Design a protein around this ligand. Structure first.
Ligand SMILES: Nc1ncnc2c1ncn2[C@@H]1O[C@H](COP(=O)(O)OP(=O)(O)OP(=O)(O)O)[C@@H](O)[C@H]1O
Ligand SMILES: Nc1ncnc2c1ncn2[C@@H]1O[C@H](COP(=O)(O)OP(=O)(O)O)[C@@H](O)[C@H]1O
Ligand SMILES: Nc1ncnc2c1ncn2[C@@H]1O[C@H](COP(=O)(O)OP(=O)(O)O)[C@@H](O)[C@H]1O
Ligand SMILES: [Mg+2]
Ligand SMILES: [Mg+2]
Ligand SMILES: [Mg+2]
Lengths: 462, 471, 460
């Protein structure tokens, strides 16, 4: 049925001419390339019964006038429980070997997002274990979480800790989606998943750096399509982890040029807002089920005004910004406590003490940041006695936010310490009130509890 | 071919159509599978028309019928308390709306004679605004600031303090997240401020033309009430995203790019929208439609193309800085840059009597604070700290106009200078309780809407005796 | 019946094709619409007997293949006695519903600029009533005045005051041109005009934000053409007020892209200087009569390096730059004394008592700006005794510049105060001589004359 011929090829885009019937948009085409077949995706209808298609794999080898067949439906994927504990392709194929999948049901990649009124309003937090996050920017169950970070400021590390804290010792289903990041991390994770035993409940999809643009574009969806199935069909709460969602929006720009679209600011595609909305709004908690998504956002050249990171901000309930200034200062996790915010931080949700303390440390840290200009050129001795005490407390609070990570145990050589929400608020309160003014600032780094902070101060004295 | 044609090309939510001989500009087109469009580029041979929603369904050959109608929004009193899309179709998912009249989306703003000077306050219920940066009915006031500075917070807080004041409200969510729009819908209906409120929604998932139209549809529904002779409060959240949608449309339609890749008429886009907001003369009812547009700055960059555009259109603006927001000054308003081009014209006489110099004092206090790192100044700086503590107030707790007058009186006339700065926030709370319970002079202030010799001497005495004990 | 037909429509830019004889550039074309006529102005000749036009109203309704008719000349407008006290649009049609206009004579808005021979060297000043201006940048009778500023700096309010001071008191007619600013402000002026009784001695042309590009473009020429008539034909003294002359350029840029023009520096039209030059050179006094042009100029994002204000500066005799830094301090009129210039600030014109204090003021303020870096970081404590006095005196003169305006009683909440050139000069001179080093700097804020400032200190 519906067989056509290739008119012209242009890197990652191919133009095909159909004699009779023309395939609808997002339909999957197939060409019999040398040995293995290649999958293409139709995008535009040009004219003279011709369609412009983006390839899902390398186009090297394609001649002009080759045969190509329409499937009719979009790219459909094995979906359901069959996929669990197996790494999947962009096309939905298993790349882990270990036989073919036990696929019962199927479902297309491209499908409209949940309409208004199908959505549900839930505003309950959950402790991550991480002090800076749990206090200032607490994550929300069934919410969209965002991890903004420049090149190598510990955003992938942070994910690996969050899956280790949340998805490890909990009964719920999980989903991971590798998008245009390291293939090393793929093997590293798949090993750590199996040996830990989380592999069983979680499902993996991968389309990494090595993969062409078309692949990196659509992998973001397939994994989401899998995550959608569990909140819909089974009606079960699922977790979705993506790294890195930027690489999806990035791929767009590589393709957009070839589709002949007029470039917008910083040579991005002009449909950046909608192309991202058509994905991001699909990642949401409905009535039928609930998805808690935690996706990482790469910031190119540490430039958050860049339109790719800029637009993503307006799709998130909680956001955790990672600053290079903090990482360089030698503090991990390198979380900016002022730039990072969450919708849940309100008396309604977190209570009185949580909110009261959270706003107080922000006020102190803000004042430290204000005076940081003057101190840089003159010194600490010049600023008034009133400021002097607030600065000294700020530097301790700032360093207390640092704590060792279980994933980075091999790195740091320290037992990563999970701190509960109630013991964090206790700590930042005692430090603020000035009951730990006697303790040095070098007794707060990579500690955890405040009880352990004083233990480090006594360890010195010996 | 006459009032019809066929699609010879389609992709990325636009379609070049052959035929449609006598198709007019901005005409509503009908495609198969019950999807809509809009003809814009009426070129020599083809017709560039943008598609609303399900564009993926369309393909080459599909027949296109011309309605011979301008795109129009259904407007009625039935809409109140319900959520609407760009077109007017209800997405609340709880019944259907029926309207008496059908009003057009795009339409010219009123004339010079049509209007009259604004001279009646739209009380937001925020001390720091209604005091020193007041808003009037028919005015356009921008709420500009960085991400997460409390822009929408001010928007809704305004809506909250329009219960009983008898003013319709329209929250236009442009390029927002459906999840976020739901949060708004709930908090309004929870507080019971939804039944005199409408929500127009063109979320990020929805196509650019629907986002583009959203605020024009929103204001047309506002015009219905205005023409009848009723006061309206429309809100655009936010025009910075609205612009990006128009950018999408243009660059796909092949209308060439300008500065920051935005098309030529991104000023005119927001000019004709905001101008539409006005107060009409008594001859045409005297019905108003106040507009509060929102803008999202990038790291406090107001030199950017759109933020600067909108500032020059509106009748003043409100600036929010995270330097204050994080410092613990909410709502984080910068008095220095924030101005209202209507001034005390849109204020009750009682308010003018107290909150006149307060803006200048704070602007001068801002300067002298940098120096303090004379004994007359040491007094001014003391009043500075105290003024700000009052201007600081929480969310979802808008003050009545009468409660504002007394709050400004106590600090300005110097009945707050001989107590601790930490307790001034608590002082005004206990005073408003004591004055409501015992004296019952707030009801008089509300009725009189002025400060008589009686009321001032009543305050003078009732404040003096209140200081018998400090908590 | 030189009939044509529409080929294609793209927003404001409409292409039309004529059968036999083609219409020349800049002439007006009419098209029949439902219960109204739309006016298009031809700009270019594309080829194959096709011409590209720019509509003077919204193009929502135009269909391909409609009947267009050529008037065979530019947009001719009413002018003379009839236009006085009437609100006109871009086409010169009344928009006040005060019956129809029956005008004495009718000019086109596209006219040649007066040549080198036609001009005259006046260069004689007049006082405004505003201290800052008439001291450091005095305005010239029949000259070219301009007010530069951003948004919310106070240049519209300043024009309103200049009208209140000059046009109300003095005789002769005037002409206000609302070029692409707020329609609210239009009614606010029209309200003040009729109550003051100035309306009778003035003609108002308007084409505000809400209007499309073509309107905002050619509205300046309509208001100009009204003023041109009054100086030449009538021969009376004219005052031309324009707000804002940036919007003329802006309208140009919107359409420019669609007229096939490659964009120039910071995305303007490539013919920015000549388009402006063609209109500005036309606004002038001549031998046959003089007009006093006071045209406010917007400054995109307070950036004076931006082309639009940069190329405008050249055209003006007197320039009053308004600084947001000064507006942030909260001292209106927020005029920058270092950036404000006038060709009339010379020994020749204002004498040497004026000229010397004017500079001595600027000299002091320039020093203050240099020392402003030091007092910020290091403080006043670390500052010489010689400089300490030239800081406090500089701060006092800075705050004394601010005076209450009549129009801005609604803002400042004070009765506006006119101050003559004599009283101004003495006030600032007395501060320089170190007389009022006793009087605190708070006592100079929004005060008319030095007499009042010295009084205010003890008053409070
Ligand atoms: N007056 C106030 N008092 C206390 N908290 C406030 C106040 N105003 C705003 N907030 C808090 O500040 C946060 C941000 O407010 P809001 O979301 O309105 O700002 P925004 O800039 O519109 O957000 P976004 O950038 O996500 O659109 C909210 O969590 C809100 O609770
Ligand atoms: N939580 C942490 N504790 C200690 N070191 C860290 C932490 N996070 C990151 N690092 C250091 O910074 C590097 C960057 O981590 P990675 O997650 O790859 O950043 P990104 O994903 O942003 O490139 C790590 O190799 C590690 O050395
Ligand atoms: N003479 C003045 N006195 C006091 N305030 C003024 C004065 N002129 C302008 N302002 C302030 O600036 C605002 C008006 O500025 P405006 O004339 O609109 O400037 P622009 O034309 O640059 O927008 C008012 O809200 C007012 O607070
Ligand atoms: Mg990484
Ligand atoms: Mg908001
Ligand atoms: Mg103005």
């Amino acid at each position: 049925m519906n067989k056509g011929t290739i008119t012209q090829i242009i890197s990652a885009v191919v133009d095909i001419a159909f004699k009779d019937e023309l395939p609808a948009i997002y339909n999957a085409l197939k060409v019999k390339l040398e040995d293995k077949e290649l999958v293409l995706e139709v995008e535009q209808h040009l004219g003279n019964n011709v369609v412009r298609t983006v390839a899902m794999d390398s186009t090297d080898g394609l001649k002009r006038g080759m045969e190509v067949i329409d499937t009719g439906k979009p790219i459909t994927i094995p979906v359901g429980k069959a996929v669990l504990g197996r790494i999947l392709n962009v096309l939905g194929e298993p790349v882990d070997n270990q036989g073919p999948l036990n696929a019962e049901t199927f479902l297309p990649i491209h499908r409209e997002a949940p309409e208004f009124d199908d959505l549900e309003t839930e505003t309950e937090i959950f402790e991550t274990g991480i002090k800076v996050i749990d206090l200032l920017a607490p994550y929300i169950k069934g919410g969209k979480i965002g991890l903004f970070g420049g090149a190598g400021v510990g955003k992938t590390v942070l994910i690996m800790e969050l899956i280790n804290n949340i998805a490890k010792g909990h009964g719920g289903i999980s989903v991971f989606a590798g998008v245009g990041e390291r293939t090393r991390e793929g093997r590293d994770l798949y090993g750590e998943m199996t040996e830990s035993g989380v592999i069983t409940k979680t499902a993996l999809v991968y389309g990494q750096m090595n993969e062409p643009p078309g692949a990196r574009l659509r992998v973001a969806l397939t994994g989401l399509t899998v995550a959608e199935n569990f909140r819909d069909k089974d009606g079960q709460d699922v977790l979705l982890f993506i790294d890195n969602i930027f690489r999806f929006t990035q791929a767009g720009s590589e393709v957009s040029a070839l589709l002949g679209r007029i470039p917008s600011a910083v040579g991005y595609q002009p449909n950046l807002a909608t192309e991202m909305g058509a994905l991001q709004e699909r990642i949401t908690s409905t009535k039928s089920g609930s998805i808690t998504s935690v996706q990482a956002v790469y910031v190119p050249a540490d430039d958050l005004t860049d339109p790719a990171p800029a637009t993503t901000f307006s799709h998130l309930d909680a956001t955790t910004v990672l600053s290079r200034n903090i990482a360089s200062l030698g503090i991990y996790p390198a979380v900016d406590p002022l730039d990072s915010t969450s919708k849940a931080l309100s008396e309604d949700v977190v209570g009185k003490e949580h909110y009261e303390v959270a706003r107080k440390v922000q006020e102190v840290l803000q004042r430290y940041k204000e005076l940081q200009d003057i101190i840089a050129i003159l010194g600490m001795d010049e600023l008034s006695d009133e400021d002097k005490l607030t600065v000294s407390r700020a530097r301790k609070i700032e360093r207390f936010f640092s704590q060792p990570f279980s994933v980075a145990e091999q790195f740091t050589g320290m037992e990563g310490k999970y701190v509960p929400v109630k013991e964090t608020i206790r700590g930042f309160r005692e430090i603020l009130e000035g009951k730990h003014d006697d303790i040095p600032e070098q007794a707060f780094l990579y500690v955890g509890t405040i009880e352990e902070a004083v233990a480090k101060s006594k360890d010195l004295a010996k | 071919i006459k009032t019809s044609g066929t699609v010879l090309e389609v992709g990325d939510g636009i379609a070049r159509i052959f035929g449609l001989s006598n198709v007019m500009s901005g005409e509503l087109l009908e495609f198969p599978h019950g999807v809509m469009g809009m003809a814009l580029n009426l070129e020599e041979d083809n017709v560039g028309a943008v598609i609303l929603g399900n564009a993926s369904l369309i393909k080459e050959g599909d027949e296109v019928r011309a309605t011979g109608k301008v795109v129009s929004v259904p407007a009625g009193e039935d809409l109140l308390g319900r959520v609407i899309n760009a077109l007017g179709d209800p997405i609340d998912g709880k019944g259907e709306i029926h309207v008496d009249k059908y009003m057009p989306i795009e339409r010219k703003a009123s004339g010079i004679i049509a209007r009259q000077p604004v001279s009646e306050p739209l009380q937001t219920g925020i001390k720091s605004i209604d005091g020193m940066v007041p808003i009037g009915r028919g005015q356009r006031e921008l709420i500009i600031g960085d991400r997460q500075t409390g822009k929408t917070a001010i928007a809704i807080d305004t809506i909250i303090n329009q219960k009983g004041q008898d003013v319709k409200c329209i929250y236009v969510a442009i390029g927002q997240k459906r999840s976020t729009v739901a949060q708004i819908y709930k908090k309004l209906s929870d507080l019971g401020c939804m039944d005199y409120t409408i929500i127009v929604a063109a979320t990020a998932s929805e196509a650019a033309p629907l986002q583009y139209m959203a605020p024009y549809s929103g204001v047309a529904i506002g015009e219905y009430f205005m023409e009848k002779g009723e006061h309206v409060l429309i809100i655009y959240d936010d025009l910075s995203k609205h612009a990006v949608a128009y950018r999408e449309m243009s660059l796909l339609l092949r209308r060439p790019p300008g500065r920051e890749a935005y098309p030529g008429d991104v000023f005119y886009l927001h000019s004709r929208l905001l101008e539409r907001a006005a107060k009409l003369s008594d001859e045409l009812g005297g019905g108003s439609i106040t507009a509060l547009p929102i803008i999202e700055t990038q790291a406090g960059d107001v030199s950017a193309y759109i933020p600067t555009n909108v500032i020059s259109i509106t009748d003043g603006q409100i600036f929010l800085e995270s330097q204050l927001f994080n410092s613990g000054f909410r709502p984080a308003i910068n008095a220095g840059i924030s101005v209202s081009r209507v001034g005390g014209a849109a204020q009750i006489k009682a308010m003018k009597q107290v909150a006149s110099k307060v803006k200048l004092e704070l602007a001068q206090y801002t300067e002298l604070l940098t120096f303090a790192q004379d004994k007359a100044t040491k007094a001014q700086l003391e009043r500075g700290h105290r003024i700000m503590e009052i201007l600081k107030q929480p969310q979802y707790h808008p003050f009545a106009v009468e409660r504002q007058v007394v709050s400004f009186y106590i600090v300005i006339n110097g009945h707050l200078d001989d107590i601790e700065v930490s307790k001034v926030r608590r002082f005004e709370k206990e005073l408003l309780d004591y004055l409501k319970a015992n004296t019952n002079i707030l009801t008089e202030i509300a009725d009189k809407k002025a400060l008589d010799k009686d009321l001032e001497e009543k305050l003078k005495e009732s404040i003096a005796n209140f200081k018998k004990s400090f908590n």
